[PDB]
Amino acid sequence: DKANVKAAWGKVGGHAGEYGAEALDRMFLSFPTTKTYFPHFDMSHGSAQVKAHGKKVADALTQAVDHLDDLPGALSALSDLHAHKLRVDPVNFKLLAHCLLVTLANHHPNEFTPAVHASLDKFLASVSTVLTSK
Amino acid sequence: VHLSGEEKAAVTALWGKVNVDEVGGETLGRLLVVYPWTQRFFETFGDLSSASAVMGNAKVKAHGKKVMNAFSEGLHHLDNLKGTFAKLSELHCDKLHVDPENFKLLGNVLVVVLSHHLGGEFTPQAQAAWQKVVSGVANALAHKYH
Numbered sequence: 001d002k003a004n005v006k007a008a009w010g011k012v013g014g015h016a017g018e019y020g021a022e023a024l025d026r027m028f029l030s031f032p033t034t035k036t037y038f039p040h041f042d043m044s045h046g047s048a049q050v051k052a053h054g055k056k057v058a059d060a061l062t063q064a065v066d067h068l069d070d071l072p073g074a075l076s077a078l079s080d081l082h083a084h085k086l087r088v089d090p091v092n093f094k095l096l097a098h099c100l101l102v103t104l105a106n107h108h109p110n111e112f113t114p115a116v117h118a119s120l121d122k123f124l125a126s127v128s129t130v131l132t133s134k
Numbered sequence: 135v136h137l138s139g140e141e142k143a144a145v146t147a148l149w150g151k152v153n154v155d156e157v158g159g160e161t162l163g164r165l166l167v168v169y170p171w172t173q174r175f176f177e178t179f180g181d182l183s184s185a186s187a188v189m190g191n192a193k194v195k196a197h198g199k200k201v202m203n204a205f206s207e208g209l210h211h212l213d214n215l216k217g218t219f220a221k222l223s224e225l226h227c228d229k230l231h232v233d234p235e236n237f238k239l240l241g242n243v244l245v246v247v248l249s250h251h252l253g254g255e256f257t258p259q260a261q262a263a264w265q266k267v268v269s270g271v272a273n274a275l276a277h278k279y280h
């Protein structure tokens with residue numbers, strides 16, 4: 001089980017910072033309220049900040065796929081940041097997860113099968129649950 | 135929800151590039167695979183026992199086409215989605231007892247499938263307009279519950 005979500009993540013390019021950046025761009029454009037968490041970011045289309053943040057998000061999720069047996073432990077610091085410090089409303093994690101699925105499907109539809117879609121949705125929801133906890 | 139003239143023209147142009155049969159089957163099939171409780175509503179459709187069975191089920195595909203045809207009606211009445219979907223809202227509430235949260239899920243699966251189908255053409259801008267469309271349809275369908 002933990003190998004297969006791990007396999008699927010790589011096969012749809014989940015490692016790629018550029019896809020993290022595109023997911024953020026999609027989220028900011030479709031759901032403008034999410035921008036209020038990033039007032040320090042230049043939002044100009046080719047934003048260096050969005051590119052760098054896309055890599056942070058992709059890298060964190062890629063690390064997490066190696067730790068499906070204990071996500072709360074793997075994501076401890078990130079949970080503190082998002083839940084305690086930033087107080088991100090849980091609705092926003094559902095928006096970013098959806099935009100990540102949209103992005104991965106966009107570039108690698110052949111690898112983004114219904115089964116892979118289901119697995120990755122569960123993975124991203126699981127990460128979201130941990131990040132929304134205290 | 136309000137779409138501008140340019141947003142409307144854009145969603146119209148893009149929908150025209152879409153294979154509706156493929157997108158309908160893909161959308162309803164993925165709904166049933168990704169959110170398996172939704173299978174409860176479709177018992178009469180037969181074998182849904184695996185992802186491959188769901189995606190190969192002809193009744194799922196035919197039903198998906200009917201759902202896409204309803205989105206098509208919506209695109210022609212974006213200024214009055216509530217009126218357009220009034221009978222369908224009654225059906226899903228009073229007869230089928232579908233919790234309205236599932237209307238949002240189906241809309242977002244449709245967005246994932248349009249992305250899957252269209253690739254680069256389904257831009258972040260295109261997606262923004264389509265999110266307004268599927269939100270509008272979900273809201274219109276949820277109205278009898280209110």
Ligand code: HEM
Binds near residue numbers: 056
């Ligand atoms: C699975 C979902 C997410 C993951 C994996 C994730 C990952 C990360 C990472 C790795 C960082 C950098 C941490 C550091 O530098 O120590 C970060 C920071 C941040 N995240 Fe998230 N994030 C997620 C969801 C969200 C959402 C939905 C929002 C708000 C809409 C959000 C808002 C922020 C903000 C405002 C920062 C601070 C960044 C900065 O100041 O440059 N995150 N996140």
Ligand code: HEM
Binds near residue numbers: 222
């Ligand atoms: C945007 C969202 C939706 C739209 C536009 C839509 C549209 C439709 C349409 C056009 C029909 C056909 C009615 C007829 O042929 O007279 C139908 C039937 C039906 N819908 Fe939906 N639907 C949506 C969401 C859902 C969801 C989320 C579920 C369940 C999870 C659902 C469950 C059903 C069921 C069980 C039927 C009857 C199927 C049969 O027995 O043939 N619908 N819907």
